[PDB]
Amino acid sequence: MFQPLLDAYVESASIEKMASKSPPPLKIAVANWWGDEEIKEFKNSVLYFILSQRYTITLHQNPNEFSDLVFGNPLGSARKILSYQNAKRVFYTGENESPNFNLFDYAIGFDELDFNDRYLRMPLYYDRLHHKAESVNDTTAPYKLKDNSLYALKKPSHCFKEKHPNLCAVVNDESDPLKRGFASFVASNPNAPIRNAFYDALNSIEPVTGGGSVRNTLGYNVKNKNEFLSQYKFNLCFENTQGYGYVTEKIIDAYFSHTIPIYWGSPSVAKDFNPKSFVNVHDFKNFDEAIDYIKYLHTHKNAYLDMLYENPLNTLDGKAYFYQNLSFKKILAFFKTILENDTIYHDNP
Amino acid sequence: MFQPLLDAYVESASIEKMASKSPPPLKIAVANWWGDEEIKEFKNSVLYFILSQRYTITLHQNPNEFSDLVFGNPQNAKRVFYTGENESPNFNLFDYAIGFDELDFNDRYLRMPLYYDRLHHKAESVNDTTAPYKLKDNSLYALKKPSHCFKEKHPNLCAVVNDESDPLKRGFASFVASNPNAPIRNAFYDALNSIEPVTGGGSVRNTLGYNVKNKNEFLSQYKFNLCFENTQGYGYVTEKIIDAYFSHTIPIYWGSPSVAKDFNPKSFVNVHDFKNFDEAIDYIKYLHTHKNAYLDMLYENPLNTLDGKAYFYQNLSFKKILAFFKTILENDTIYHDN
């Protein structure tokens, strides 16, 4: 049930509207090799989106320019130059990699760590929600955006349904969720010793439908991931690697496509999402046993519809919440503190 | 006043004397990068000393031998980061880390600054029948047979601590450094060298034509000790300030800007509290010419006190360190990259 997760997300994006377009300049240095595509992707990310609500952002790719923040995680030659901008450095990557606090003053990541003002946890799933929120500011979408909220203020598109018929049909109670294939699987890397032992074991209850390169079954890689996952009862949602707190956009795609995620990745995922809403493979002593609970859910429609209908988020006294209250306000406070703090924390020899 | 610091240290070293039990074998590998003197230092560290109270340790450097833990500093064994440098841990490479950073990473990180290891060493050196500082009878550090040489090696220190001399009746400020890659420390030195001359007993800015043999005896001869860390790190408080307290001299400190969390600010000059060096020096001048204020500072407890008890920040103790390692040994998780 995506709608309540989206509602919670939209509320977490609630902040005071800034008055009369006087957003102070913020100069951010980013990867020098980024081309116009990567730049476009960055101007579309939730971090940029959030910051644009309070600053007039300029991006810098010239190494001989001063900046307010140097952003990212350069490697090789570009990591050396970083050492010299001795600018206010902020570590940020989509990879399962913890920050180097000798080189970076501040960091935004997935680790469950407290370093006072120097670190903020902003999992990748928050950014995927931002993209799902934008894609449904469409007049044909089956998910609704609170009137007048930040995501509803830009003009809406009209392509969603044409692009996600099946998804719309089932979200719109015009199809029966029980009347679907067993499970979808979309992945690009074959080497995943833990994932395969699991695909082989899931793929031996009923065939698993593959839409990506690994274990493909359709004979072609699916065009729209979300439309494809909505055609199955479950979605094989294993992260590429394990990290405590490392919850990617994958589980969000399952929720969004109205299918039950079968999750494995961060052993603490239950902190971020309601475990009654997905098969948390970590809540079992072995796969063997988890395969059995999936086998059960697949043949006991009541338990299956129970899970599909749980709020993706945990609740405390009826109010749904993001773990540690992640929100636009929390993220903007973190940046206002970084910008106003003149202390140099990185190695400055 | 080192005595109260030692008392709190000895108390922090108190552990249950499980005797019905026996220390189980614990196999510890050290990385190859580690030189023989880095291995000798480790064998002599307070961490090794603490662990040896609950485990029968075997330390080796054979990467072919299955071990319970492996210690390094930049396999499928649990790796523990441990270094003396002002270097934050790489958690991609190490499952666990012992450091100085003010960080909380649940069971993966433990703060144990080098000053705690320097206290361990001073405590041993004072298990000596001619020593000016006392160790509670029946404490861990008093169990071994003592030495009889302390006074001989530190006459002046015993005199002042033994009240056979007057604290005010001494030189101005000592400075013992041998590292030159420390610009801020030099600039502060040249600036302090103004109130009066600052006697230099080490390589760097050496005064008396030679290097002193006993750092502590020497420091006990001055009213203050110029106590600068080589670089700034939040939480990076080394052995230096402990040498000042041990030598019954006022530390003039710079290094960790959060040093007041670890030590009682009324007990030393914290250069970080001033907007510029000039202002810090003005304060030093004042202490040097106001006997009541100087003595007050010299007699303060080096540690902060709360609820009637002197304490180490965040309750650093043998028990805290033993629980951290017990948790590592019992947890099968491997966090490092593979």
XYZ file of N, CA and C in Angstrom, chain A residues 219-349:
393
model
N 13.016 -12.823 -22.187
C 13.757 -12.805 -23.433
C 14.079 -11.375 -23.830
N 13.930 -10.462 -22.880
C 14.196 -9.048 -23.120
C 14.036 -8.375 -21.769
N 14.833 -7.343 -21.525
C 14.790 -6.595 -20.273
C 13.595 -5.650 -20.265
N 12.761 -5.753 -19.232
C 11.556 -4.940 -19.143
C 11.804 -3.444 -19.378
N 10.815 -2.746 -19.944
C 10.950 -1.308 -20.234
C 10.698 -0.419 -19.011
N 9.583 -0.665 -18.336
C 9.240 0.096 -17.164
C 9.239 -0.848 -15.980
N 10.155 -0.625 -15.055
C 10.257 -1.508 -13.923
C 8.995 -1.563 -13.098
N 8.444 -0.399 -12.828
C 7.276 -0.381 -11.965
C 6.036 -1.056 -12.567
N 5.866 -0.971 -13.864
C 4.694 -1.627 -14.448
C 4.900 -3.155 -14.323
N 6.118 -3.621 -14.635
C 6.438 -5.034 -14.561
C 6.275 -5.628 -13.158
N 6.811 -4.983 -12.120
C 6.652 -5.574 -10.786
C 5.181 -5.623 -10.353
N 4.333 -4.701 -10.851
C 2.913 -4.706 -10.435
C 2.161 -5.916 -10.954
N 2.772 -6.665 -11.848
C 2.079 -7.844 -12.379
C 2.327 -9.107 -11.541
N 3.089 -8.992 -10.459
C 3.337 -10.159 -9.642
C 2.986 -9.934 -8.194
N 2.758 -11.040 -7.495
C 2.356 -10.956 -6.125
C 3.504 -10.493 -5.220
N 4.729 -10.862 -5.592
C 5.898 -10.552 -4.774
C 7.003 -10.006 -5.632
N 7.926 -9.294 -4.987
C 9.086 -8.820 -5.713
C 10.379 -9.204 -4.945
N 11.273 -9.902 -5.625
C 12.544 -10.292 -5.050
C 13.393 -9.009 -4.966
N 13.497 -8.525 -3.738
C 14.150 -7.277 -3.375
C 15.431 -7.426 -2.534
N 16.487 -8.014 -3.104
C 17.739 -8.214 -2.410
C 18.711 -7.093 -2.808
N 19.344 -6.454 -1.820
C 20.317 -5.413 -2.145
C 21.531 -6.125 -2.702
N 22.331 -5.372 -3.447
C 23.535 -5.899 -4.067
C 24.616 -6.288 -3.041
N 24.620 -5.630 -1.887
C 25.582 -5.934 -0.813
C 24.918 -5.573 0.492
N 25.469 -6.096 1.583
C 24.947 -5.850 2.927
C 25.645 -4.711 3.689
N 24.832 -3.904 4.363
C 25.323 -2.835 5.209
C 24.244 -2.465 6.182
N 24.617 -2.274 7.437
C 23.646 -1.873 8.398
C 23.196 -0.451 8.097
N 21.907 -0.306 7.799
C 21.339 0.980 7.437
C 21.331 1.140 5.929
N 21.954 0.226 5.175
C 22.014 0.421 3.690
C 20.742 -0.084 2.954
N 19.703 0.751 2.997
C 18.425 0.426 2.386
C 18.305 1.293 1.158
N 18.310 0.665 -0.002
C 18.253 1.415 -1.253
C 16.838 1.701 -1.787
N 16.789 2.201 -3.012
C 15.510 2.466 -3.653
C 14.713 1.163 -3.956
N 15.360 -0.002 -3.944
C 14.635 -1.231 -4.281
C 13.310 -1.489 -3.541
N 13.325 -1.387 -2.219
C 12.127 -1.687 -1.479
C 11.042 -0.677 -1.818
N 11.437 0.547 -2.147
C 10.468 1.559 -2.490
C 9.741 1.205 -3.786
N 10.481 0.640 -4.734
C 9.906 0.230 -6.014
C 8.853 -0.872 -5.775
N 9.140 -1.810 -4.867
C 8.170 -2.839 -4.560
C 6.894 -2.233 -3.999
N 7.005 -1.331 -3.015
C 5.868 -0.694 -2.399
C 5.074 0.085 -3.405
N 5.798 0.792 -4.246
C 5.178 1.619 -5.246
C 4.337 0.796 -6.289
N 4.828 -0.388 -6.605
C 4.188 -1.267 -7.553
C 3.127 -2.191 -6.884
N 2.734 -1.882 -5.651
C 1.691 -2.654 -4.994
C 1.996 -4.138 -4.939
N 3.241 -4.503 -4.652
C 3.647 -5.909 -4.579
C 4.412 -6.090 -3.269
N 4.430 -7.311 -2.747
C 5.104 -7.577 -1.471
C 6.596 -7.743 -1.615
N 7.372 -6.859 -0.951
C 8.821 -7.044 -1.108
C 9.350 -8.255 -0.336
N 10.263 -8.998 -0.929
C 10.927 -10.093 -0.205
C 12.333 -9.452 -0.056
N 12.599 -8.916 1.128
C 13.820 -8.137 1.423
C 15.028 -8.768 2.080
N 16.206 -8.374 1.611
C 17.457 -8.805 2.237
C 18.485 -7.728 1.919
N 19.210 -7.253 2.924
C 20.211 -6.208 2.668
C 20.650 -5.678 4.016
N 20.000 -4.628 4.475
C 20.304 -4.091 5.782
C 19.594 -4.900 6.897
N 20.349 -5.547 7.776
C 19.677 -6.302 8.834
C 18.815 -5.443 9.754
N 18.915 -4.118 9.651
C 18.106 -3.268 10.528
C 16.987 -2.556 9.785
N 16.643 -3.070 8.601
C 15.560 -2.503 7.758
C 14.263 -2.310 8.541
N 14.015 -3.221 9.482
C 12.825 -3.104 10.299
C 12.787 -1.745 11.018
N 13.915 -1.034 11.138
C 13.829 0.278 11.799
C 13.224 1.324 10.931
N 13.487 1.188 9.625
C 13.062 2.091 8.572
C 11.655 1.782 8.063
N 11.323 0.497 7.994
C 9.981 0.095 7.488
C 9.264 -0.944 8.385
N 7.939 -0.852 8.429
C 7.074 -1.796 9.180
C 7.282 -3.259 8.677
N 7.894 -4.131 9.486
C 8.141 -5.525 9.083
C 6.920 -6.423 8.843
N 5.733 -5.910 9.176
C 4.482 -6.623 8.925
C 4.083 -6.292 7.473
N 4.881 -5.419 6.830
C 4.571 -5.054 5.445
C 5.498 -5.714 4.428
N 6.368 -6.621 4.863
C 7.212 -7.252 3.868
C 7.858 -8.453 4.475
N 8.397 -9.303 3.620
C 9.065 -10.461 4.111
C 10.490 -10.005 4.390
N 10.763 -9.780 5.670
C 12.095 -9.386 6.095
C 12.906 -10.659 6.250
N 13.617 -11.024 5.204
C 14.407 -12.226 5.246
C 15.347 -12.291 6.444
N 15.598 -11.156 7.097
C 16.496 -11.146 8.255
C 15.760 -11.624 9.530
N 14.428 -11.592 9.530
C 13.683 -12.042 10.705
C 13.544 -13.578 10.790
N 14.395 -14.313 10.063
C 14.384 -15.790 10.016
C 15.773 -16.353 10.281
N 15.866 -17.532 10.899
C 17.203 -18.033 11.178
C 17.897 -18.585 9.937
N 17.125 -18.917 8.917
C 17.728 -19.397 7.684
C 16.811 -19.071 6.529
N 17.314 -19.247 5.313
C 16.533 -18.966 4.116
C 15.432 -19.997 4.056
N 15.861 -21.246 4.198
C 15.004 -22.421 4.234
C 13.639 -22.029 4.836
N 13.702 -21.532 6.063
C 12.544 -21.112 6.838
C 11.777 -19.922 6.272
N 12.504 -18.972 5.673
C 11.896 -17.779 5.073
C 11.154 -18.181 3.810
N 11.737 -19.102 3.042
C 11.105 -19.620 1.821
C 9.740 -20.193 2.222
N 9.707 -20.865 3.372
C 8.473 -21.439 3.909
C 7.422 -20.379 4.257
N 7.839 -19.242 4.808
C 6.838 -18.230 5.123
C 6.347 -17.583 3.825
N 7.177 -17.587 2.786
C 6.754 -17.004 1.524
C 5.775 -17.981 0.877
N 6.145 -19.259 0.926
C 5.293 -20.321 0.400
C 3.918 -20.158 1.101
N 3.929 -19.961 2.426
C 2.691 -19.769 3.186
C 1.907 -18.566 2.675
N 2.530 -17.384 2.631
C 1.825 -16.163 2.163
C 1.223 -16.305 0.766
N 1.902 -17.058 -0.081
C 1.430 -17.262 -1.434
C 0.168 -18.157 -1.546
N -0.096 -18.952 -0.508
C -1.230 -19.880 -0.533
C -2.249 -19.645 0.561
N -2.167 -18.497 1.236
C -3.124 -18.150 2.280
C -3.473 -16.702 2.048
N -4.304 -16.470 1.040
C -4.718 -15.128 0.619
C -5.004 -14.098 1.695
N -5.386 -14.557 2.875
C -5.696 -13.622 3.934
C -4.461 -12.989 4.520
N -3.470 -13.833 4.771
C -2.214 -13.379 5.322
C -1.531 -12.551 4.231
N -1.689 -12.970 2.981
C -1.083 -12.215 1.904
C -1.688 -10.798 1.751
N -3.012 -10.687 1.795
C -3.619 -9.371 1.660
C -3.363 -8.531 2.913
N -3.131 -9.198 4.039
C -2.857 -8.509 5.297
C -1.578 -7.637 5.116
N -0.500 -8.304 4.692
C 0.816 -7.698 4.458
C 0.751 -6.600 3.384
N 0.127 -6.908 2.238
C 0.020 -5.961 1.140
C -0.630 -4.685 1.588
N -1.488 -4.810 2.585
C -2.227 -3.647 3.077
C -1.641 -2.918 4.305
N -0.606 -3.495 4.909
C 0.056 -2.843 6.042
C 0.679 -1.524 5.535
N 0.813 -0.562 6.436
C 1.418 0.741 6.121
C 2.888 0.400 5.938
N 3.508 0.869 4.855
C 4.938 0.532 4.724
C 5.751 1.062 5.926
N 5.342 2.197 6.487
C 6.074 2.746 7.633
C 5.640 2.252 9.021
N 6.571 2.261 9.967
C 6.232 1.883 11.333
C 5.373 3.059 11.878
N 4.600 2.819 12.941
C 3.812 3.870 13.573
C 4.083 3.870 15.052
N 3.908 5.031 15.662
C 4.028 5.190 17.104
C 2.777 5.967 17.457
N 1.817 5.286 18.088
C 0.559 5.922 18.505
C -0.260 6.464 17.349
N -0.430 5.629 16.336
C -1.203 6.015 15.173
C -0.526 6.900 14.128
N 0.547 7.598 14.500
C 1.223 8.490 13.553
C 2.359 7.721 12.873
N 2.327 7.704 11.538
C 3.365 7.013 10.748
C 4.660 7.847 10.820
N 5.829 7.221 10.836
C 7.058 8.036 10.882
C 8.206 7.428 10.120
N 9.112 8.312 9.701
C 10.347 7.878 9.074
C 11.344 7.692 10.258
N 12.162 6.648 10.197
C 13.114 6.384 11.263
C 13.964 7.650 11.512
N 14.131 8.005 12.784
C 14.862 9.205 13.241
C 14.291 10.529 12.674
N 13.015 10.501 12.317
C 12.340 11.670 11.803
C 12.979 12.392 10.603
N 13.535 11.612 9.688
C 14.101 12.183 8.458
C 13.051 13.124 7.797
N 13.459 14.312 7.361
C 12.547 15.243 6.768
C 13.304 16.386 6.089
N 12.583 17.179 5.301
C 13.190 18.323 4.678
C 13.751 19.237 5.771
N 13.013 19.436 6.862
C 13.484 20.307 7.948
C 14.818 19.827 8.563
N 14.931 18.519 8.791
C 16.118 17.934 9.387
C 17.306 18.115 8.430
N 17.062 17.922 7.142
C 18.118 18.050 6.161
C 18.566 19.515 5.983
N 17.626 20.444 5.975
C 17.968 21.855 5.872
C 18.674 22.348 7.133
N 18.274 21.843 8.297
C 18.960 22.259 9.544
C 20.429 21.797 9.473
N 20.612 20.567 9.006
C 21.966 20.013 8.904
C 22.834 20.924 8.026
N 22.324 21.321 6.858
C 23.073 22.241 6.012
C 23.253 23.667 6.515
N 22.275 24.200 7.227
C 22.412 25.550 7.780
C 23.540 25.504 8.842
N 23.592 24.416 9.581
C 24.668 24.263 10.579
C 26.063 24.133 9.889
N 26.146 23.355 8.819
C 27.406 23.222 8.118
C 27.873 24.600 7.591
N 26.955 25.324 6.956
C 27.306 26.599 6.350
C 27.691 27.682 7.351
N 27.071 27.668 8.515
C 27.354 28.633 9.537
C 28.517 28.249 10.429
N 29.022 27.028 10.305
C 30.124 26.554 11.166
C 31.452 26.745 10.424
N 32.338 27.588 10.957
C 33.609 27.825 10.281
C 34.703 26.875 10.694
N 34.403 25.963 11.618
C 35.483 25.046 12.037
C 35.950 24.131 10.876
N 37.264 23.965 10.698
C 37.785 23.053 9.698
C 38.061 21.739 10.440
N 37.363 20.677 10.013
C 37.518 19.365 10.597
C 38.433 18.491 9.783
N 38.523 18.688 8.464
C 39.389 17.815 7.626
C 40.876 18.032 7.871
N 41.692 17.030 7.556
C 43.158 17.126 7.785
C 43.625 18.401 7.057
N 44.247 19.317 7.793
C 44.638 20.632 7.265
C 46.058 20.855 7.722
N 46.994 20.195 7.062
C 48.437 20.261 7.360
C 49.124 21.523 6.785
